Amino acid sequence: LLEKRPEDVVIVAANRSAIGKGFKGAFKDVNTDYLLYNFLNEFIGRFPEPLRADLNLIEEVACGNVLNVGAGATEHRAACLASGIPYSTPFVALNRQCSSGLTAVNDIANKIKVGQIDIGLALGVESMTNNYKNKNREAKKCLMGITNENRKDQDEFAANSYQKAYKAKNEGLFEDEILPIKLPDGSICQSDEGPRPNVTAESLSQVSDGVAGVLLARRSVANQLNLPVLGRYIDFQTVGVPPEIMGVGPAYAIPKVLEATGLQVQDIDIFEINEAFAAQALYCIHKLGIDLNKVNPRGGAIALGHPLGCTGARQVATILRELKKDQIGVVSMCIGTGMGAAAIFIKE
Amino acid sequence: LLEKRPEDVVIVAANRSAIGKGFKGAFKDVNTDYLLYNFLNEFIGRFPEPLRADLNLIEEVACGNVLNVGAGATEHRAACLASGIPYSTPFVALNRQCSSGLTAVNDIANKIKVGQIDIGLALGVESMTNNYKNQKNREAKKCLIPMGITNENRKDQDEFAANSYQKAYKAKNEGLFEDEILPIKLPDGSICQSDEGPRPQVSDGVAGVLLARRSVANQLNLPVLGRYIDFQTVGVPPEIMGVGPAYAIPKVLEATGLQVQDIDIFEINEAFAAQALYCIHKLGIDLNKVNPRGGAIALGHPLGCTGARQVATILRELKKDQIGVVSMCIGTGMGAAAIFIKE
Numbered sequence: 001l002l003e004k005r006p007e008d009v010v011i012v013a014a015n016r017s018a019i020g021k022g023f024k025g026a027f028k029d030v031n032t033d034y035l036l037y038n039f040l041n042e043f044i045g046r047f048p049e050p051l052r053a054d055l056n057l058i059e060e061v062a063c064g065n066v067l068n069v070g071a072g073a074t075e076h077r078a079a080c081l082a083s084g085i086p087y088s089t090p091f092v093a094l095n096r097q098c099s100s101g102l103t104a105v106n107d108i109a110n111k112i113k114v115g116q117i118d119i120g121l122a123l124g125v126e127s128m129t130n131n132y133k134n135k136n137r138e139a140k141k142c143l144m145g146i147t148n149e150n151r152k153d154q155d156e157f158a159a160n161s162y163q164k165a166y167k168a169k170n171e172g173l174f175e176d177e178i179l180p181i182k183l184p185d186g187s188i189c190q191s192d193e194g195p196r197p198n199v200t201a202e203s204l205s206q207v208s209d210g211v212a213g214v215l216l217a218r219r220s221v222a223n224q225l226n227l228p229v230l231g232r233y234i235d236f237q238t239v240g241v242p243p244e245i246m247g248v249g250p251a252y253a254i255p256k257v258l259e260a261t262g263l264q265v266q267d268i269d270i271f272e273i274n275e276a277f278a279a280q281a282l283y284c285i286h287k288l289g290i291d292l293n294k295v296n297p298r299g300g301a302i303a304l305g306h307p308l309g310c311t312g313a314r315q316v317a318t319i320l321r322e323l324k325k326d327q328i329g330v331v332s333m334c335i336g337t338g339m340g341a342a343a344i345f346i347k348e
Numbered sequence: 349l350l351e352k353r354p355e356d357v358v359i360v361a362a363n364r365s366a367i368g369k370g371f372k373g374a375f376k377d378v379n380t381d382y383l384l385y386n387f388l389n390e391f392i393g394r395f396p397e398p399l400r401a402d403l404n405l406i407e408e409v410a411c412g413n414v415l416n417v418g419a420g421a422t423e424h425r426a427a428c429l430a431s432g433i434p435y436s437t438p439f440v441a442l443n444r445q446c447s448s449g450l451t452a453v454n455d456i457a458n459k460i461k462v463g464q465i466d467i468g469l470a471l472g473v474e475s476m477t478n479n480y481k482n483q484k485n486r487e488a489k490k491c492l493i494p495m496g497i498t499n500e501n502r503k504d505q506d507e508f509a510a511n512s513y514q515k516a517y518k519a520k521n522e523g524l525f526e527d528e529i530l531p532i533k534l535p536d537g538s539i540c541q542s543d544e545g546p547r548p549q550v551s552d553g554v555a556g557v558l559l560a561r562r563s564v565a566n567q568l569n570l571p572v573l574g575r576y577i578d579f580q581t582v583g584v585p586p587e588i589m590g591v592g593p594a595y596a597i598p599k600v601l602e603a604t605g606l607q608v609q610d611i612d613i614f615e616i617n618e619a620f621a622a623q624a625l626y627c628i629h630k631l632g633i634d635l636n637k638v639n640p641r642g643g644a645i646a647l648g649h650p651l652g653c654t655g656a657r658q659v660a661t662i663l664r665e666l667k668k669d670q671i672g673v674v675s676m677c678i679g680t681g682m683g684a685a686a687i688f689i690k691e
Contacts, residue, residue: 069415081488
C-alpha cells in the first residue's frame, strides 16, 4: 500500500482559505462566487509551471456546495472562468451535504482512475453567511442539533479543540495551507477567525464561510510533467446512517473504508474526524477506539468552524500538513440527511 | 467493444415518466419530491424480484437536478427514503445543467468500474413549473447569456422542428413510448402517462436508470436491457454553448475507437433546432439515425431529467447489439455524450 505504483491518484496541491465567521466574519459582505474567484487566483499562482502554462490541462472541476440554488453551478463555473481556467474545461456541481467537498475529491479520484481524465481539480465553497437564507415518517426526518441531542465530556472536548486550534494558530501551523483572500475594502484575510485563547470549560461547530481546493493527477502524468506530489488519495467510502442520529456517520464509514483497504484503526497515524458537534465526535472516537491523541491534532470544526461545502476538502489540505512522509491518515465526517463518508490518504 | 465481459456496467432497468408541460401541464401542481416519490414507487415495482426483495443492494443514488436549492439534495433523499429505499443507501445530488441526468449515470458507472459499488441508481428530475424562479468581466458574463440568445449565435429549423413533432406523435400514437413511460398518479385522482407536448419546450419530468456490474447481474438473476460504454465531457465557448455535441461526440467516439458510421441511433438532445442542426451537419450524420421517435422540440426538455430520459428512449429504439449515442449541449458552455450497446 505504501508502494508507489504509476496508476496512483496523486495530490499535487491542496489549499484552503482562512475560515471566516458566519454573519460577523471577514467574508460577510461576499458570496461563494467572489470567494471562489479569489481563492482560484491564489491557488493557480501556487501551481507548478507546466500547469499554469496550459490551464486546459485540468480536465475537470468538481465543486461541492450545499446552499446555493442548484449548488452554485452557474456562478462557480463563471468564477473559474474569471480565474483563467479555460472554457475547454468541464465543471460539475455536487452536494452530498457536509461531505460535499470530500466527495468532490472522490469524483475526480474515480474519473482519473477510470481514465476519463488525468488531471482534475476538486473544490469546496460555502458562504453560510449569505446563504442560510435559503410530515409522514422516514422522509419526515431529513434536513442538526436535535439529532445531536439524541455535557462535561462535550465541553471538555470543545475546549481542547479550541486549545489545539489556538496553539496551532499561534505557532504558525496553518500558515502553509491557508491562502490570503483579498476583501473588497482593501483588507486581506489569512487567519481563521474562530479559534480563541483561554477557552477552558464553561456552562452556558461554527457557522462560517470558506473555500478549499485540491488538485489531483495520476502518478504517471505527474512524473512525465514533473509535478510536486504531496501525498496520494487511497480510497473513499460512504454509508447510509439513521437520519435522526446523523452524527453517528464516522462510526460506520471508517470501519468501511478500513475493511475495503485492509488497514485497521491502529494503522492510522492521524484522524481528521469532523466535529459537527462535540457529543457526536466523542461518540465516534470512543466507539471505534481511536486514540484521542491521534484525533484532530490542530483543532477541529468546533473551533475552526464548518463551512458546509468547503469542509471536506479543507480537512484534506489540513491533514496533509499534519502528516509526515509515509503516514496514513483518514478524513471522516457525519453527513446531513443521515450519511457517513471517509477517505484514506498517505504522505507521498 | 461488442464483446461482453463480466466487468461491464450493465443497465438493469431504465424508465421515465411522461414529460408534463411547463406552467400548465399535468404536473404543474406538484414538485420534484412528489414526481420522485411516485416515479420510484412505480420503478421499484417494475424491478426484478431480487432487488425489490432487498432494495438495500442499491448502494448509491446519484440524482441530477439543476434548479432546486442545492439541487434538491434534502427533498429528494426524503423521497427516496419515503419510496422505501433504505437509509443505508447513500445519496448524491449533481448538477451539470442540461446533462445532469446523464452525468448522474456517469457517476454510477465510474463507482461501479472503480469497484466502489456494484449496483447503483441514476436519476434525473425537474419541475420547471415550480422552481424556474430560483461578473462584470469579458469572460464570465458569457455565463449570463440566455440560452436562446446563445442559439441566436429559419426554414431549416422549422423543417427540423416539424419532424420532431411528427415523429413524436406518430410514435406516441403508434404506442412506441409505452414500455418506457411509467404512470404518475396525481393528487386530483388523474393518473398521468402520456406526453403532452407532442400534439401535431419547458417541462417537468423524472427519469431513472439502474446500473449494475455484469458479473453481479448474472449472480442475482437480473434482466439486462443493455450496456454503458463510455461518457465524455468537453467545455465549449459559452457564447455558442450549443455547439457542444459537435465536440463531445468525436471525443467519446475517439475514446472508444468507434466512428460516426459505426453508430446506429444518435439521440442528440434538441435544445433548439438551430443548434442540433449544426452538430448533425458538422458531424455528417444520417438524419434517419437522428432522433427517430422525435425530440425535445416536441417532447420537452425538463432540464435535469433529460439525460436520464434519452437513455430510456434510446434503449427502446435500439435492437439487440446496436450501438447508439446520447449527446446534448450543456448550459454554461459544455457538451456531453455517452455510448450504449443493446445487451
